């Protein structure tokens, strides 16, 4: 009820969002950086060949860590809906 | 006996109802479409039932241009109060949308302005957070109390009016921008530095950077930055509400 | 209640320091109409009883007046309900 | 039912007026019977008695419900007849006309009460 | 007591205000506001059709207001029907359990504000509060509680859209709408975590707590 | 029924242990009250037409009018309830 | 014992007011209409087939699905009531049985358990002890959940097409094109080459 | 057997109530309306022709297409009824046949089989005896499928134009130039030059 | 032969409902608003003047365009109606002729031929004998085609500006600069200096002649 | 003076056209278009909500109509009570200040075009322009004025965007999009100079 | 009132510059009040509709 | 004000009809009282008089009731109408001029004119609800 509780609500929610999005974004960033440094080493420059492995890497990311995200988000929503009638004002 | 003078009761219960309902239809949270219309009408009716008997009853007939002037006055007062209150949420929405646009979340606006493709999701997040904070600080009760109080300052009866006062509400349009800049400032600046950092990377081997490495990094950095910046809005939320409230108190009179 | 009497003395102190409504009017009108109807009915039953002094003229006239008062109450209720329905139909 | 309590008095008065009307007409019809006593009822006392029962209990469907199933005062004779008939024409003719009038008045009052209860509901 | 004609007239007239009692004196407002907000959240403004949600809200309100209705019937309707309590006293006797139910769920701040707006004297205990103060205080408290519940409801459905947009933006697909992708995922979430049983139980507890 | 007697003994056990309003039940009770009033008036008219002694014409008419008043009561309550239900169900969330 | 004919007429004509409510809450109309709206959202165009056509088609589908229940009601309640062999109340009680079975067969256990919890129900026992006022909201909740389960998996192929087209377009280089604009004709092609309408009706019917 | 006059006018007014449903689910209005909406979406102009203009055009096209069926109904059914030659029941039965034939001409056998199998209808010998309750949903489904086919096919030339302009812009290095702004005037020019409106209406009429 | 007063009132009030349909399918309005719907797209601002401003401006322009037709209808048909020298049927027959001529002069022959063939009409001796059922949809079709022609022609100078600005931006190596935002103010410049609105309305009015 | 019931009918009917009066007769279109163009200038099409812009334009319109409202009050509101003039002579007398304002804000070319569109040859004087010719001409003049003000607003933001892009290109960066960098600088320039108050002051001066 | 007499003299200066209850009454006033209330409701509805049409704009 | 002024003529005429019928009923009641001159009013002149100057009463004063326990009481009250004497037709020994034919003709005429006033006022009020209703 108190504004401290509200702002905590937003923080924990958006940290959950950060945890959900961090693996995919970080995998894409690492793949892009690796392809870019390889291009710099080989002196190859086409703006389209960096887009190819990124999709494959990010799609594999759901294969490997997808169940973890799905279990984390469901637990968050379940706990939020269960604690809903105790943060009422 | 068995009089029950109806015109007296109607004139006593009408104009306060007009002002209360005019505030209701525009005041934030009390004007959200999710409330059924009958609930809003009943709240206005009950508030008027509580308030009106204490006020001096007016005797101007409903079939006169004076009644039209009175109705216009009540509508103006109600919409002015509600809109001045709404300005703070407008400012919060502006700050959130700008943080989100510096995230690169909606890049299609820079190339196709107003092209039916825009999602200010951060703006919505902080808008609903601001609504929750406003609910916590009981701002709506204050709004109702000030709606009641503006009578003593400005009675139902037609009273003369001023000018630059309207400018004040219009000049409040500056606040939406001015306060929005500060909220952002605590994050956009660092994001700016990040973009500057990306520039240093592009000053190296040409191409092979930006649109491939900049976007995910800046998205994650914006996310964690403003996630850490979330505790900061609440003092600024109270500052915004106080600014709107004392501006209203000073200018309505 | 003991606390209720405490509240009464508190309101008396409030009056000391300091030194009807539409629903009330409707309740008063209903009570008046019902009292008139009950008076007419009681006089009619007294006449039917055979008790001396009650004239058929007065019985019939009082029944007439009670019927008129009932019809007045019905019309007032009808309008009042119509006005309430009109107000609740307003779009906000 | 509350509706019965409102209309109980007038219904009982109307029924008592009909019964006394029958008794008076029986007195008129038997005017010539030698040895016939003129009988009548005291309207007020009997109206008190009627205004001032236990349906047997039905356990199932086959069980049969309970099956349902005034005091006459002699008139004081005025003139002594030789055949023992105490019926007087004038007295009972006046009583008959009065009972007819009161029956009409009771019908009027009961109809007015029902019509008021109706216009309360109509709408 | 009143004549039977007057009693019938009053009964028929009072039968009119049933929607007003349902909306302004009952648990209906919070449930309907929460349902509207949730429908706004999932991105399907016409999904459970208004009639389906209205029927569900009516059944929920009937299940929630059961003890209050029982107390009214045992204390007011039963003596009135048995000719023990007059028509003008059954209303007063039955308005007390509803008043108590409205009080418990109301808030001090609203009560203080509407005690000040009426220029009434000090209210040392809750037993001195009339209905003219409790009615709008209860209404405002119910509105605020419903909006709080809906606004904490809204957060996950916007979180999903945020992460969807960020993931789409990582790969450079800047011209893909995020709402169209997020809607099936929001439906999947609301299916997985017992979307309705948890919400139903949370609302019911929110009343009985 | 054998299962019916099982249910009877179960309700007896319920009474032993013991030693809930219903709107549908209340509507059923009210409809029953109206229907038995109408049927009683109808049967009284039946017997009075058949010529059975003990039935009076004024009582027949009064009972018929009472049944009419009861049915008008029911019709008005029906109108109010249907109007309230329609206005509640015509609302948008 | 039987109700008077005036009472029967009053009840019969009053009950017709709940016909839309019965059709929506108690029958298969809700699930079909929700699935159709979700499919319209999934097609990429929000109002291609007018609401009127979808509503009529959903009504016909609901009638065809419920025809066995309607036949059972007619055999059990309508026919023996119209021949003046049973009373109105007993006819309604007898006719509530096949509809109760239909509602139970599609009811989630958790929904029924929760709504029995909220109604203070204690020793329930046989599946034939659930009252109508408890069974109905549980059926509505189960129908909403099932409709959402169907919709979110109806969404899948169109998301696949959208993602494939966007990925191909951006990887090829044309990143300034709107992928949805090019994708909509392909969504229509997929829907017409699979026989999406016929298969969707088959799946909706076989969901019961 | 002939209905009394009051019953006849009751039937007439009640049937007049169902007019939009008949127009949408028994005539060619739905297919034309769907194709028009898809075409409007295809030009990149979501609100250039107002809805009322397109609705009026679809209504007039439907009237012209259904003129032979209306003439058959008038000559075979309505005219004898207006001269009191035949009753209302047999007039309606005779008027059903031409409309039924028209709807059967434009339905797909697979959808008819689906709705027959779903409704548990017994084997039906030939198209002569197919209930209207079976034919109407099948015809609606076939109309939906045909409308989607036509719209998807229509979507092709504008897709060609968009792709060619996007490629021309991209091969010049113009990386941040959106192709919609350049494509919309050329879409309008293409539709104007081929006499698009009259050609599309003629194609819709010829398909019926 | 004249209709009764009740039938005349019924027909008049019934025909009053077709006012938007008559305005769209029989007057100039369809060509105007559609062009506006495209012009706001050419300027790069879909917001543009508000929708109601454009609609009312189109309404005023339509009234000015149909002033001669309205005057001819008022003189030939409605004046004898008010001065009692004509019936309602004859007035309806006579007043439509100037409007039919106005519709025919802007009707392309191909569309008219298409709708004849589609109605299986017999050999029409001359324009004067063309049925209204054939003239109405053909007029609407020709109206749509003409509006699209005008809109595409309007789309030209703004395309010129966009192409020039994009070429200038790319020739300087400023490849990452979106030219839409830069070229929007120059489109506003072009519409202001040339007096775009007045010129466009004059061109539309002259086009109808 | 005609019947009271007809007066009520006419009054309630004229109440419907209130958005038409606000848009076509007052200046509301000008402020709303200026706000839309300014929002398009900063690069954020949803930063202030459409509701807030509409309300700000409404308040600005109320102030800038306050002199005309006062003239209406003097010529129509007051003498309608003293009954020196009423009904006809007054409604038109009260509308006269609106005519003067719209003549002031209307260009001659639009009026000339709309006159030759109505074959009104003998329109010689400038205070007897009919409403049918005055209204659409006034609306077109307002559109032109709003577009000019929008371009004037556009100039500094376009300059800032161009400067940011030029410095990015000169510094060696060829891939960094200049919009992301230039957006916060656009905002800090807009706030620091206090763009909003001067904009409203100029709009009030713009009449 | 003293201020009331001030207002009277002000209006004089302005002139210088310029140079029991029955059913019959109960029902009539009852109807007049109903009519005035309906008029107020309709006028407010028109004003609210105009305001919502203005605010539902698109800028 | 405007609506009050528009409906004022018929309302005042109907009130004057009511008062005239009260007077005629008083004349009919006293028809057998010896020494009672019949009274009547000139409807048109009194109607114009009430039109120009508002309705007034002879007395109509009453005890003031500041408290809620004060006993309410009112003294005699009557309209400000001029009660004129009717010219007798034929003499009578008792000395009253109430001729029953005249009384019953005026009673019936006043009855119809009051019903006419009710019809006109009801028509006007509907003629107004028709405009307002929407």
Residue numbers in the entry:
A (entry chain As): 1 to 89
B (entry chain At): 4 to 256
C (entry chain A5): 3 to 21, 32 to 104
D (entry chain A0): 3 to 54, 62 to 78, 83 to 136
E (entry chain Ay): 37 to 245
F (entry chain A4): 3 to 21, 31 to 104
G (entry chain Ax), H (entry chain Aw): 36 to 243
I (entry chain Av): 36 to 244
Authors' description from the paper:
The bacterial flagellar motor is a huge bidirectional rotary nanomachine that drives rotation of the flagellum for bacterial motility. The cytoplasmic C ring of the flagellar motor functions as the switch complex for the rotational direction switching from counterclockwise to clockwise. The basal body is made up of the LP ring, MS ring, C ring, rod and export apparatus. Here, we present two high-resolution cryo-electron microscopy structures of the C ring-containing flagellar basal body–hook complex from Salmonella Typhimurium, which are in the default counterclockwise state and in a constitutively active CheY mutant-induced clockwise state, respectively.
To obtain the C ring-containing basal body–hook complex in the CW state, we constructed the constitutively active double mutant D13K/Y106W of CheY (hereafter referred to as CheY**), which can mimic CheY-P to tightly bind to the C ring and lock the rotational direction of the motor in the CW state. The C ring-containing basal body–hook complex in the CW state was obtained by incubating the recombinant CheY** protein with the above purified basal body–hook complex in the CCW state. We successfully determined the cryo-EM map of the basal body–hook complex in the CheY**-locked CW state at an overall resolution of 4.3 Å. Although the structures of the LP ring, MS ring, rod, hook, and export apparatus in the CW state are highly similar to those of these components in the CCW state, the protomers of the C ring in the CW state notably undergo inclination and compaction, suggesting that the binding of CheY** induces significant conformational changes of the C ring for rotational switching.
